[PDB]
A paper describes a structure:
Among them, [name] ([name]) binds to the polymerases and acts as a sliding clamp to tether them on DNA, enhancing their processivity. Eukaryotic [name] is a homotrimer, forming a ring encircling double-stranded DNA. One example of the [name]-coordinated process is the lagging strand maturation, which involves at least four [name]-interacting enzymes, Pol δ, [name] (Ribonuclease H2), [name] ([name]), and LIG1 (DNA ligase 1). Two structurally resolved classes ([name]-[name] and [name]-[name]-[name] complexes) have captured a series of 3D snapshots for the primer-removal steps of Okazaki fragment maturation.
The first class, which accounts for 47% particles, is a [name]-[name] complex with a short DNA in the central channel of [name]. In these structures, [name] binds to one monomer of the [name] ring, and the other two PIP box accommodation sites are vacant. One strand of the DNA, which is the template strand, is continuous, and the daughter strand is disconnected at the catalytic center of [name], resulting in a ~90° bending of the bound DNA. The two terminal regions of the bound DNA are in double-stranded form. While the downstream [name]-bound dsDNA is about 12 bp, the upstream dsDNA varies in length (14–19 bp in different structures) and passes through the [name] ring. The high-resolution density maps show that the phosphodiester bond of the 3′-end of the 5′-flap DNA in the catalytic center of [name] is broken, indicating that the DNA substrate is in the post-catalytic state. Interestingly, the DNA substrate in our structures is different from all previous ones: The cleaved 5′-flap remains stably bound in the enzymatic center, with the +1 nucleotide of the 5′-flap still basepairing with the template strand. During the 3D classification, the [name]-[name] particles were grouped in eight classes for structural refinement. Two major differences on the bound DNA in these states are their orientations relative to the [name] ring and the bending angles between the upstream and downstream dsDNA segments. The DNA was seen to have a rotation around the channel axis of [name]. These states are named state A to state H based on the clockwise position of the [name] in the side view. In conclusion, these analyses show that [name] is dynamic on the [name] ring, which could undergo continuous conformational change to accommodate the DNA length variation between [name] and the catalytic center of [name].
Residue numbers in the entry:
A (entry chain A), C (entry chain B): 1 to 254
B (entry chain C): 1 to 256
D (entry chain D): 2 to 352
Amino acid sequence: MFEARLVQGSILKKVLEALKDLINEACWDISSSGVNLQSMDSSHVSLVQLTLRSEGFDTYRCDRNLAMGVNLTSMSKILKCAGNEDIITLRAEDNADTLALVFEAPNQEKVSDYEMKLMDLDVEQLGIPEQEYSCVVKMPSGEFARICRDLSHIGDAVVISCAKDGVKFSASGELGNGNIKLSQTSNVDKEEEAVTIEMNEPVQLTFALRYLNFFTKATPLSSTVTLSMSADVPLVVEYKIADMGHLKYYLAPK
Amino acid sequence: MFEARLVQGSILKKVLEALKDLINEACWDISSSGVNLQSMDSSHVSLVQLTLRSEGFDTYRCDRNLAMGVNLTSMSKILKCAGNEDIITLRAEDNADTLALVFEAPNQEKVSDYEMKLMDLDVEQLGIPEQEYSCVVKMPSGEFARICRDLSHIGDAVVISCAKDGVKFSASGELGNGNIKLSQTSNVDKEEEAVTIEMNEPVQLTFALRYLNFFTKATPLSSTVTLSMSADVPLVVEYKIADMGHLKYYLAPKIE
Amino acid sequence: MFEARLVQGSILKKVLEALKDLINEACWDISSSGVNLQSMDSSHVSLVQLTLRSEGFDTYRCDRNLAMGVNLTSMSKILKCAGNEDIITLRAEDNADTLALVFEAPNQEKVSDYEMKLMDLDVEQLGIPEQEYSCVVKMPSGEFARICRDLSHIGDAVVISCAKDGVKFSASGELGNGNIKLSQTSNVDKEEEAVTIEMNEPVQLTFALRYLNFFTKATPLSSTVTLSMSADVPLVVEYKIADMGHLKYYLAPK
Amino acid sequence: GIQGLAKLIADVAPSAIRENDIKSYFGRKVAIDASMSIYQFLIAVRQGGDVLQNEEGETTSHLMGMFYRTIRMMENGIKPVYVFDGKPPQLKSGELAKRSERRAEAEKQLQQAQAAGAEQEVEKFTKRLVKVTKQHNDECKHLLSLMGIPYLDAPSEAEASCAALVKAGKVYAAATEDMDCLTFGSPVLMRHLTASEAKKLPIQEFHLSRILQELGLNQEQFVDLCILLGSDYCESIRGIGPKRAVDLIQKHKSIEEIVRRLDPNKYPVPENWLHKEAHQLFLEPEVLDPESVELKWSEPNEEELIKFMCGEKQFSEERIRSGVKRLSKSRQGSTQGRLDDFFKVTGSLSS
DNA sequence: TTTTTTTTTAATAATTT
DNA sequence: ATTAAAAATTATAATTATTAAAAAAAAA
DNA sequence: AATTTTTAAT
DNA sequence: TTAT
């Protein structure tokens, strides 16, 4: 009897608005420690690591380790029915494959019980032994969300270059040449919209920009995104969700 | 000959955005006591009963019982030209081949005359009796716009059930099952966010959500919608316009 | 060899959103005394004259009569890669056929160096003469944005009738007949709401609406638009572009 | 078919024509004459320049066209019954003699078309050579048995037996391209029942009881109007067309007083003037009993279409299997009732 | 009321084979 | 001349995949 | 099935 | 052996 009452219902809703266009179907590795999702996209390029710990949920309990298969497009349209101020309870059943979502606004009386039909794909999870990286670019997410939106009009590839002064999202293309030389600000005021770049070694990697448009759909979760990368390892697009775990995205470079 | 001056002209604007997606062509039964529209859908399911009374209009005068066959898609293109604050005057003289809409702007002085070419329609009117409905639910209007938009993502059929202390908007489909419960909140002092359920016998029906999504475009008119049900009697989605009248949406249920 | 630093970026941004639908390919006749453009649309009906003077730019350093060929769809994509308060610095080079655009944020440190691949085209000097105008109708620009959009639902033919008491926009079609009549409001204290008509010869002639709808995409550039025309003269839909020159739109009548 | 009955109805009685929608019926069963559907889906849907076929030789364009049309009809709640034409009567053989020479005129024209080889004229001329045999329907009635939709083999005529099905009340409408179903006496005739969602061809409904109210006739004299309008059984009078036969029937009522109240110099009576035989054929044809067969609606199967059409007709696997799933999601739901079952029409209002 | 963004539509050949 | 009718000439399309606009929903 | 010009009658 |  999995039951996760979440009082801030926009946290789960904005996750599913980000995975509805990139993950077709995945296994929610739901344990007693927290909600986990190690997935990979339908074009088999990118990797998604979503972690929701049990401290962010209000009442969390798991009788066993539940790994059910949920269609991410169908769960996102059902979470489109929830309000932005709703309270979301996930009353999954061990005996029958049905994930019951209960929405209830605290100011209102609207008890919105939503049950799902579940296709258990039983996909084996992909785990990555994460290590230290070269440049840990803690950068504002809603300002990063337009940066991949700007350079996608020019070309389908970007070159992200960590330097001494700051990062440089240089993107070429047949329409022209585009360089966004974002210097590091690191002001002590307004930490939710500041840039923090850690410096270890000079970095020059060429990426694919079609999936970075998909990666910026999780930007209403966190104000700050981490772009942590190294020399020949995929970058971690880490969205630190407030008082929970994290939603990390991966992209193997060109 | 017929002149219907409306100071709050956005009321007549918000009517025709709610009927342009349902009624292609309607007959406006212009009486001397008001403006009436009883035009059933071309899909033979849903009736629209519109009642703009004479006392709600500012300067209403009328002589004969007019009947203007109006392409309501062409009316909503013309009525989109006025803004939300313009004084809207309808005009139709003797041998009424055309309807003259005058969108008198009150402050910027944009006197917009709009002469509509009408159409020839022979639309049968349906005899609506006066009966007592079983479960009369007085919802917020914006809440009902949410609920029909929510359950249309699951399936094309809502299952409206009236419990003893609530109303249940159940639905099912390929995505799963969705139940929306609304307990009555008559203790709340404001009537804008209050659900009032008038109960004498419980009733459970099944209605199509494609027509109910067309019905929830009248939500900019009123802040409170009334749903009326009985056993094998159509759903009356009534939007009571303040000091003007009602926009009643009839809806034939699904019978097993 | 040419640097045109501009303080606010929405002046160049709202030009290109007005010009992306109407003009697909034109040449920017950039002079030492300002930025000029004497284009004509892809259907060869409406002639577009643009002037951005040198005194309205913050730093103007033009050295030669530069006439580069700019794809206006490719420029308006790069002008979509900027904020509404950005600092836009254009650059050009003598040997390279490249128009460079540097976007500077005013409160941030986002330097967005954009370069454009240019091409050679038919450099046409249209050369319209200045002449007198019988009916000069200055109106609010959002009012002219409404009336061209309001009458486009009926048909594609607008007659514009002049009087000292007001101006009449009338359109007709198979859907119905429209007649929008303004009034010469001389009692309005502000200038962004008053309609001012300087007429000596009354005039009434039919204009198309597919090109007048593209003329009303320049309505965020200024709050006032002036309509100058005569009996056989094309109508001047003239905008202001703050205090930097003017944007003349000519439309030949039907 | 009939030379301009639809133009006469639209130019005489426009209140008997209702341009409806594809979703406007929604539970009312119709009776498709399947022969015009089979000719429509062998003439319109081509591979380009010829018929569309697999490598086994036979054609299957009508199977996919009538497949997606049938699935789109039951998506909108319309429940089809497909009535196929049987052995035609001997009065129709004069039209089949005209159809034999008009097919053979295109056979000689195909020799002239294949010399030039221009695809604007090759594909235009080979559309006239479309012929439906027994194997064009024996491989086509087998598909509708997989749906559970009833297919009816008429003993004499599918246009006749569709009109007997509406007459008994077993079906609501006869959805038939020709105007003959008004002549055998269907009170509702439907036209242009097409799977497209656009209004390029609105669906036009012929109410025969509204025709006979507007014309002031009954069934036995609307047949007599069809004989002067050039039916397929017997030819019409050489000087009388659409506009000269409405006023003539309304002046002289029966067909036996058309001839005796006419000057034969201006209007020559033809030698093949079998009006009395066609009047017996139009009122009482030898059709099957509509009470003998019941319109059963069985559950469709998905695995049997794999061995019949995904393998033999080598179609797309992701479209037939999607087609049964979009059929069964529009079949198990409840039927939406019309509003006329609850409210009755009180006032007839006109502009 | 109006910016920008996503969702339907009317688009139009393009196979469907 | 208008009306009308028979010589002849052309027609039977529907799904997915894009696609380029075109208004709608969320938030300006 | 509809058009469509040409031939024919009121 | 069979559509308008």
